[PDB]
Design a protein around this ligand. Sequence first.
Ligand SMILES: [Mg+2]
Ligand SMILES: [Mg+2]
Ligand SMILES: [Mg+2]
Ligand SMILES: [Mg+2]
Ligand SMILES: [Mg+2]
Ligand SMILES: [Mg+2]
Ligand SMILES: [Mg+2]
Ligand SMILES: [Mg+2]
Ligand SMILES: [Mg+2]
Ligand SMILES: [Mg+2]
Ligand SMILES: [Mg+2]
Ligand SMILES: [Mg+2]
Ligand SMILES: [Mg+2]
Ligand SMILES: [Mg+2]
Ligand SMILES: [Mg+2]
Ligand SMILES: [Mg+2]
Ligand SMILES: [Mg+2]
Ligand SMILES: [Mg+2]
Ligand SMILES: [Mg+2]
Ligand SMILES: [Mg+2]
Ligand SMILES: [Mg+2]
Ligand SMILES: [Mg+2]
Ligand SMILES: [Mg+2]
Ligand SMILES: [Mg+2]
Ligand SMILES: [Mg+2]
Ligand SMILES: [Mg+2]
Ligand SMILES: [Mg+2]
Ligand SMILES: [Mg+2]
Ligand SMILES: [Mg+2]
Ligand SMILES: [Mg+2]
Ligand SMILES: [Mg+2]
Ligand SMILES: [Mg+2]
Ligand SMILES: [Mg+2]
Ligand SMILES: [Mg+2]
Ligand SMILES: [Mg+2]
Ligand SMILES: [Mg+2]
Lengths: 185, 148, 156, 51, 53, 222
Amino acid sequence: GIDHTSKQHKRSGHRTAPKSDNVYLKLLVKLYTFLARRTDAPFNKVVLKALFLSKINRPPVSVSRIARALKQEGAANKTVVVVGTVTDDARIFEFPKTTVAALRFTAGARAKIVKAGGECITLDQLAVRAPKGQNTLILRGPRNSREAVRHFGMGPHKGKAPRILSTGRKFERARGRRRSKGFKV
Amino acid sequence: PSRFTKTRKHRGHVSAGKGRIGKHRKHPGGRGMAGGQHHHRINMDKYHPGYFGKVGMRYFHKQQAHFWKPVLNLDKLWTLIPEDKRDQYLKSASKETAPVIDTLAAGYGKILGKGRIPNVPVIVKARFVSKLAEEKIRAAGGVVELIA
Amino acid sequence: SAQKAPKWYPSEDVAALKKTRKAARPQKLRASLVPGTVLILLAGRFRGKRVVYLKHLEDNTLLISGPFKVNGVPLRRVNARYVIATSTKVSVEGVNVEKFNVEYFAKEEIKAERVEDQKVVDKALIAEIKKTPLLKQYLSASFSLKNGDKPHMLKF
Amino acid sequence: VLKKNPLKNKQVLLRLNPYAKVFAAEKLGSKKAEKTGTKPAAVFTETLKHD
Amino acid sequence: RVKANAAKRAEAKAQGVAVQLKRQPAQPRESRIVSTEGNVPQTLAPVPYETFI
Amino acid sequence: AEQVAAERAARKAANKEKRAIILERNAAYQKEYETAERNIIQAKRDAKAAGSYYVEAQHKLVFVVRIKGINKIPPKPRKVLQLLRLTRINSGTFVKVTKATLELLKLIEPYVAYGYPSYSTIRQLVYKRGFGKINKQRVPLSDNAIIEANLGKYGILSIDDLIHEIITVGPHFKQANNFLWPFKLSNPSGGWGVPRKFKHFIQGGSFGNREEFINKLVKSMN
RNA sequence: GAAAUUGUUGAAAGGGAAGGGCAUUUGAUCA
RNA sequence: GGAAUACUGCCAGCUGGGACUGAGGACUGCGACGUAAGUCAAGGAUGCUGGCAAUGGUUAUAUGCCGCCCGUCUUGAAACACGGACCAAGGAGUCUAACGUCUAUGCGAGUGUUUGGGUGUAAAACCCAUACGCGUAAUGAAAGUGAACGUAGGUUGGGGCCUCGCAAGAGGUGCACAAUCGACCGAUCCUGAUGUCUUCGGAUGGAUUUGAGUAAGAGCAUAGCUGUUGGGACCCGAAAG
RNA sequence: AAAUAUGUAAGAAGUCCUUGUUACUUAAUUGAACGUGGACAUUUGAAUGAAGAGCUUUUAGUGGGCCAUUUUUGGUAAGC
Ligand SMILES: [Mg+2]
Ligand SMILES: [Mg+2]
Ligand SMILES: [Mg+2]
Ligand SMILES: [Mg+2]
Ligand SMILES: [Mg+2]
Ligand SMILES: [Mg+2]
Ligand SMILES: [Mg+2]
Ligand SMILES: [Mg+2]
Ligand SMILES: [Mg+2]
Ligand SMILES: [Mg+2]
Ligand SMILES: [Mg+2]
Ligand SMILES: [Mg+2]
Ligand SMILES: [Mg+2]
Ligand SMILES: [Mg+2]
Ligand SMILES: [Mg+2]
Ligand SMILES: [Mg+2]
Ligand SMILES: [Mg+2]
Ligand SMILES: [Mg+2]
Ligand SMILES: [Mg+2]
Ligand SMILES: [Mg+2]
Ligand SMILES: [Mg+2]
Ligand SMILES: [Mg+2]
Ligand SMILES: [Mg+2]
Ligand SMILES: [Mg+2]
Ligand SMILES: [Mg+2]
Ligand SMILES: [Mg+2]
Ligand SMILES: [Mg+2]
Ligand SMILES: [Mg+2]
Ligand SMILES: [Mg+2]
Ligand SMILES: [Mg+2]
Ligand SMILES: [Mg+2]
Ligand SMILES: [Mg+2]
Ligand SMILES: [Mg+2]
Ligand SMILES: [Mg+2]
Ligand SMILES: [Mg+2]
Ligand SMILES: [Mg+2]
């Protein structure tokens, strides 16, 4: 026998396939298993592993936030990349001259770009434009503001949005929620 | 799909997932939300504070219509303009000859100020409005009239 | 259909084998296998008979005969490990050796061509073996084994 | 696919350690170290067989 | 410890190139002849039992 | 457009010269060993010549083999034999014996057998059972290219340079010993020489320190 | 027209149950 | 005094006897040899000769050794604990509603055809107007009020991208996330300007006080496992009312 | 007044220097806290080891235990 040091026969802990049986994306994975393995371009690793993620580790970037990532000091006229979907945003009009690749686009996505002269490219048409990811900005969606996560690990004095269906007064609001009824949380 | 369950894997495992000591008896805790104040006090003071007692005064025969006042913030407000009409109102921006937007027609009752505006003069009639909205509407040249 | 055959397949290519890095030798033979030693048959039809050691035929068999008119032993191939090494010297030579290579015993009612070679070899030797007294009379006496003998103590 | 061990299979004893073959010429394990004629002191041996 | 560590790195290149700034644990002691001169070994042996109380 | 044999006839000379630079230090090591040890014996006989004792320089390296089974072990002795790569029976490794290294061997003493190994013991031990940790991958050490590749950072490229780098506990002993794998030894050939093996060596048992004796033991566990 | 259970036939075993695991002799039987 | 021998130990000293195994299957490796052809024990066995049309597997019995009857409750069962004489068929975690998590799909600040209409080859499919639900704002018991000082903030770290450097490195930009300090909306406690139907209005600046808030939105719908509660609710079971 | 057991520490989130911010403090530009800007990769600051570490969600069974060495309490004792 052996005085085993750490847990034997433990699996990785990390996704290696987005098991959407989506035959089309199940092709893009096989393409990038090429790149990171035969480029060593550190950009080529990131997006392939970031390709696998489930829908919630894949939040949307909005045309809103991409606009300012080139209001970044020294990016205004460069192409960007983000794995996933991208949404229109009717709250910005100073949209720039630009070009961007992402999994799929909403309606206004391809609108706000054309209205400002931009372009909306599928990423398969990207991989040949920057093999090593030359001059590629990557932005991620804000994973930790989905509605569900706002009650993860709620306890007393952590004040984190109890799980409740009908909301308002009389609904989990008196005892344990003010010193007027016993105590507060 | 029945086969996709896991209770078809418990077949041949006498206690069928529910154990030899603890067995799957019918109602160990009391039926439903029984004993919330006695032997479930942790799981309701925790996860569900404010749950007991009365918290404030009541109102007899209320109607969720008297307080229908949907809020729109200065964020959108130009979606009440077709795009084949707003860029031809962004360029071509003037006090006279100005685009107007009836809030209430879109189904809104109060207008609040969140997200500052393009400066094209817009004059839009609402019923109730937040103060910061009126000011940043007057900063673009426009004003607010009051409908009912 | 009734089974639906697979698609990934092998294919009938007897893969080339790879070098056997092996080098041979004639037996690094036992220390007492000196040509011209009486030896003792242990397996075969004549098994048990006593013989005299001659050429180490290049297929590792060991030519020996009785001579023939001694113990009816023709000149024969033997595997070394089926004959024990006695300790009994013979003469230098007088025997033709070079004729018996490993081919010699290729078989294709009696035979005519090597019977006179055996009758050259035998008299070439018996003229020597009676030089020593009762050794002629000793190999004449086919070997046998007797009761109570402990081989770990018995020399030859 | 397999490990061969030195101290047997003497060919691989030279894949490492080439000095090995110089080792074989000079006995090196039977190196006759050359003698010294120093005699132990007396105040030491007296106490070594002191009761 | 670090104040003593301050100067001892100046002499890294100032004198040569030799630094030695790390701390280290105790070591088995090195070879040391020790002499009989005025120090002859005092042979000893155990003692028997007795009460004396 | 051949480009082929240009880059491969450079390694014949590369290897013949790195072999010639291995040779030099190997011969230098035999020189080192016999000069040091004959100087030791001569200092002993010189102090005995002029009436005194040359005290042995207390040892700087010790070999340790763990024995007792996987099970029924207190938390902290279990922890420390986990802490010295010793998670199996008859496995073993070396220790740089400082006197901080030292006080853990005296916590595991009834589960191990250890002491001071001869050159020849260590050489026979790392020739037959020397293994290297490579992305853990427990590689066997068929030739010196691999310690060249892992420890070209220490001027250490020969197997006997490595032997020297531990039998002399060299300035980068630890970066070498940790690279070495634990040594999967068998049970000793001539038995354990003691009937019940879980008593201290001093007590006719088999655990504890056996200073020059583990040699006889470990050479038997070949 | 199954099992339990039952009869004839045939083969083998059996000193206070039987059945079983391992390897083998022996006999039977499948390249 | 001059030696030999014992004990202990080193040999990269020499040779015999036995046993087990022979994975891999173009070549690719570091070797060894020589002066050079060319060789080899050097990244896993070859070669010669001899034998059967045999030897292999299963089964029954015999021998050697080992083996208490399952299931169950149990700290503890072969138990003098319970059920089980034997056999066939039936024989127990289901469906539903409303839900937690996570996953797959479509669309995306929106989503959701199927109350209903249109249509139809007819319970399918197909197409559709208004509404509606949920989300898109919160917060107070409430009347109520209702999210940019700024490149929507600083700071620490941060993947990736950028610039120089051969490179090592150096700097730049820094999303997700983590931490923290501020800024913004509601609550509460304050501070209380011009104006005055003299009590109205609540400017401005604030705080060891509170919210499940904004701070360049993420959700909505469908389905799947799992989990929850209500249900006959895994299946059989009372004394009772 | 031990043994065993135990709390903090062994650097770059550091150490030096400069004088900026403020409604705190001081008689005081005094100190307080937080920064600008400025300097030192061998041996970046003990030993050893690491199939690498951090972080989140959701949920099963369980909540009758017993034994052994050493410490130990009640009981004469107990397979208490
Ligand atoms: Mg095992
Ligand atoms: Mg309190
Ligand atoms: Mg189970
Ligand atoms: Mg059962
Ligand atoms: Mg279960
Ligand atoms: Mg049960
Ligand atoms: Mg239960
Ligand atoms: Mg034996
Ligand atoms: Mg014993
Ligand atoms: Mg029947
Ligand atoms: Mg009978
Ligand atoms: Mg009877
Ligand atoms: Mg039997
Ligand atoms: Mg000896
Ligand atoms: Mg030897
Ligand atoms: Mg028995
Ligand atoms: Mg009981
Ligand atoms: Mg039982
Ligand atoms: Mg039992
Ligand atoms: Mg009983
Ligand atoms: Mg019962
Ligand atoms: Mg019964
Ligand atoms: Mg019966
Ligand atoms: Mg059935
Ligand atoms: Mg219609
Ligand atoms: Mg219609
Ligand atoms: Mg119509
Ligand atoms: Mg009933
Ligand atoms: Mg009744
Ligand atoms: Mg009643
Ligand atoms: Mg690692
Ligand atoms: Mg749990
Ligand atoms: Mg539970
Ligand atoms: Mg639990
Ligand atoms: Mg219980
Ligand atoms: Mg025990």
